[PDB]
């Protein structure tokens, strides 16, 4: 509720906050980070015409609409996060594959994923509008499904050495011991 922002006004300006018991909380040693999805609609909204505009001005307009001038005045900075590029997508895929490998090692299953398989996963999952979250689902369906089957009623019961590689005729994945 926009009425809640006034508490943050008081805190950001004075670093103190008085609860119901007259007790004052000390915020001087607390980092205050607030995450929003405001103004995103305009930035991704397509203008009508031959040339599209930078809607970052509209993002600023929307943020100013939502946050009163003094609230914007009591901020250290507003960090405008950008979308994720394709190489960033590759790195995100590497990160998620590492996490999946840790999960598998918890079960005692080593896993190797080829490089072109990583590239293919990134190409399949890259979605500019949704950032890095689609990569989680893509990796999930493309790897965990056969892996879950092999860990439940398959070869990878108390054993690993699962290799995943990509062919070029069907863009499919290898598996098995």
């Amino acid at each position: 509720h926009p009425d809640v922002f006034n508490i943050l006004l008081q805190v950001m300006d004075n670093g103190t906050l008085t609860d119901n018991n007259g007790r004052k909380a000390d915020f001087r040693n607390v980092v205050l980070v607030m995450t929003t999805n405001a103004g995103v609609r305009e930035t991704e909204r397509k203008s009508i015409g031959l040339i599209h505009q930078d809607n970052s001005t509209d993002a600023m307009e929307e943020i100013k609409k939502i946050f009163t001038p003094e609230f914007r005045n009591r901020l250290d900075n507003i960090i405008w996060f950008d979308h994720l590029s394709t190489d960033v997508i590759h790195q995100v895929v590497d990160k998620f594959i590492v996490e999946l490998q840790v999960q598998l090692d918890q079960k005692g299953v080593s896993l190797e994923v080829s490089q072109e398989a990583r590239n293919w996963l990134a190409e399949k999952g890259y979605d500019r509008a949704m950032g890095a979250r689609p990569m989680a689902r893509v990796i999930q369906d493309n790897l965990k499904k056969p892996l879950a089957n092999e860990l439940l009623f398959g070869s990878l019961v108390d054993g690993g050495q699962v290799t995943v590689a990509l062919d070029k005729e069907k863009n499919e994945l290898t598996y098995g011991f």
Binding site: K46, S47, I48, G49, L50
Partner: protein
């Protein structure tokens, strides 16, 4: 008035549109009469709006025109080429030089015509009055325009440039099957 209103029930119901706006809502655009600046600009605005609505769904341009100025037709053609969604041109009634060009300029595989529709093509017309030097300038300009039109037609129909050049020397009429065989349209719409 002359244009009747219609009623549509989507969210609150009783959404009164004129018939042309009611069809524009379905991503269908009409091109009638001569091609001039204001009408072509209206078509361009409609195409831009339809692209902004859904860049993936096709746009249907129902063409029935006895021609027009080459420049407005070029504007419409450039707008059709630039936008991402495919423009399906349907020639009903008849389509003359500029109309036929805009018809054949549709998305490959989506240029249709009706069984009794007529298609006519010819070299662009024009002229000028004045001093000899200005006459020569305007003549060279219109010849460049004619060459560009022939190149675009040869590109969109697949015919040879010399074939288009020898064909459009005079007014050449084409029926629907003749147009299909010539390559101006992809197929003839018959029934639902």
């Amino acid at each position: 008035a002359l244009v009747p209103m219609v009623i549509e029930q989507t969210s609150r119901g009783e959404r009164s549109f004129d018939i042309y706006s009611r069809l524009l809502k379905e991503r269908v655009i009409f091109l009638t009469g001569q091609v001039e600046d204001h009408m072509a600009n209206l078509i361009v605005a409609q195409m831009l709006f339809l692209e902004a609505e859904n860049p993936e769904k096709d746009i249907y341009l129902y063409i029935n025109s006895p021609g027009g100025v080459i420049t407005a037709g070029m504007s419409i053609y450039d707008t059709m080429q630039f936008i991402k969604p495919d423009v399906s041109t349907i020639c009903m009634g008849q389509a003359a030089s500029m109309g036929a060009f805009l018809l054949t300029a549709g998305a490959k595989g989506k240029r249709f015509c009706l069984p009794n529709s007529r298609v006519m093509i010819h070299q662009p017309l024009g002229g000028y009055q004045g001093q000899a030097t200005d006459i020569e300038i305007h003549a060279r300009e219109i010849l460049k325009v004619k060459g560009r039109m022939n190149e675009l037609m040869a590109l969109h129909t697949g015919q040879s440039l010399e074939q288009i050049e020898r064909d459009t020397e005079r007014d050449r009429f084409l029926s629907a099957p003749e147009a299909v065989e010539y390559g101006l349209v992809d197929s003839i719409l018959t029934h639902r």
